[PDB]
């Protein structure tokens, strides 16, 4: 390699290394903001958890609850991705997961849907010719419920309207900025909940079969919510995590290009002294 | 001598692309260098991961360097290294290890030592 | 020169000791401008807390600085600056603010420069 090229080489690569280090620190804030958010909304989970386990338990119940003995004509699958690349394995994962999991159970696409929030996950859906139904495709950073209130309605409406009497969503569980776990989760039908209290319950019953219809699309609905900001927590994280990699890499590069670079100046600056002296003394 | 009327048709083709697949893999040594292979494309990803396994496989023991380890040499005939190179190619043996294709010869002594750890 | 054979051991493991703190110190400086001082665990915020100091005190008064500064200067042995900078390690002064460090001597100038402030 000539120095010319050694020295553009070693330019773009400063350059790069300025970028991802930005990014990784922007990713840094975001996955601060992140956090505490997803820390704002564990109340309202812990009460409605509460209030659902107290009701739902004891009795027959709305088709929600339970109700195993449903037929599965059709599955439904709930996959969350980033709308971005350059998170490491974060989409990449989920995907595989997603694919396996289909193929191990499902012989034909008849038989069961997709509801894929992200345009990764949409892009690898459409490249595999697969029946995606409904997606989203844009959401904020720190994404609020009414940014997903009406696709989770959508998406608990279908399971009450036959179209398919099976939920299953796959995100990736946020455990620390190292480590992401991709996570399959039971949505519909409720397959079991715990027990803290029997009458605990806030709203003393007007109706059983009243109550149920309105507190059990808003408990999936709130579960859909809760594994939403996990979700962008991962995510975050998982940016950070990359470009923190990417910097040390290319400064690692920047390095031993600047070597090779001395090396051929010092090399170039011998050549020519050699040959002026060579036909100095050819006279 | 790398000419399909001296060493054959298949031979031919089988070299030619085993040196097409290590091509493209040298061609995106500085993507992985600086940021991995997590935004390659699927082919890009299949590349790589066939050209590893073709790499690792074009390496062998030898009978003379059995004093520096204790490893026994291996005499691999043509028309083995032919067949196991098409069978990389095309595929079959994407779910081994890459460490299973280090030092063996044979294309049947991969099988046995990716057996012999864990798979 | 820095080897405990010939400068001893004390003096080895402290200098050792007020390098790695102000390692981790030059480590934690994204993170505290990015979140702020009060994300931190509270190991890092002691961490950050005794290496300002040790920074501090590795500033001294020159005597050739008196013609401009007003202060005449010290001369500091080795004993004296090992002893403060382990008693520094060891947050025998963690209580006194930090720009009681700034420009002095022996280590009871520190002291003294405190209670003079307040």
Do not use: C, W
Not at chain 1, 81 to 92: C, F, I, V
Not at chain 2, 53 to 76: C, D, K, M, W
Request: overall charge neutral.
């Amino acid at each position: 390699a000539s120095l010319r090229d050694i020295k553009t080489r070693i330019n773009a690569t400063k350059k790069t290394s300025q970028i991802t280090k930005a990014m990784e620190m922007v990713s840094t804030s975001k996955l601060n903001r992140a956090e505490q958010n997803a820390k704002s909304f564990v109340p309202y989970m812990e009460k409605i958890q509460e209030v659902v386990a107290n009701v739902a338990l004891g009795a027959g119940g709305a088709s929600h609850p339970m109700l195993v003995s449903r037929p599965v004509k059709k599955t439904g699958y709930l996959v969350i991705t980033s709308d971005r690349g350059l998170a490491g394995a974060y989409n990449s994962n989920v995907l595989r997961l997603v694919y396996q999991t289909i193929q191990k159970r499902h012989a034909s696409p008849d038989e069961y849907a997709i509801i894929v929030i992200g345009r990764v996950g949409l892009s690898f859906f459409r490249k595999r010719n697969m029946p995606v139904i409904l997606d989203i495709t844009r959401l904020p950073d720190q994404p609020s419920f009414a940014d997903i209130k009406e696709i989770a309605r959508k998406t608990v409406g279908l399971f009450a309207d036959g179209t398919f009497d099976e939920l299953y969503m796959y995100y990736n569980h946020y455990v620390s900025a190292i480590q992401q776990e991709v996570t399959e989760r039971k949505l519909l039908p409720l397959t079991d909940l715990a027990e803290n209290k029997q009458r605990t319950v806030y709203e003393f019953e007007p109706s059983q079969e009243e109550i149920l219809d309105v507190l059990l699309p808003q408990y999936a609905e709130s579960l859909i919510y809760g594994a939403l900001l996990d979700a962008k927590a991962s995510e975050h994280a998982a940016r950070m995590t990359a470009m923190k990699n990417a910097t040390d890499n290319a400064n690692e590069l920047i390095r031993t290009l600047t070597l090779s670079y001395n090396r051929a100046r010092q090399a170039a600056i011998t050549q020519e002294i050699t040959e002026i002296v060579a036909g100095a003394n050819a006279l | 001598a790398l000419a399909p009327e001296i060493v054959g048709e298949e031979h031919y083709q089988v070299a030619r692309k085993v040196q097409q697949t290590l091509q493209r893999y040298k061609e995106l040594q500085d993507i992985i260098a600086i940021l991995g292979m997590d935004e390659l494309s699927d082919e890009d990803k299949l590349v790589v991961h066939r050209a590893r396994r073709i790499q690792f496989f074009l390496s062998q023991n030898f009978h003379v360097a059995e004093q520096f380890t204790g490893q026994p040499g291996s005499y691999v005939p043509v028309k083995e290294t032919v067949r196991g190179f098409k069978e990389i190619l095309e595929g079959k043996y994407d779910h081994l290890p890459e460490d299973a294709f280090r030092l063996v010869g044979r294309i049947e002594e991969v099988v046995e030592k990716a057996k012999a750890m864990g798979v």
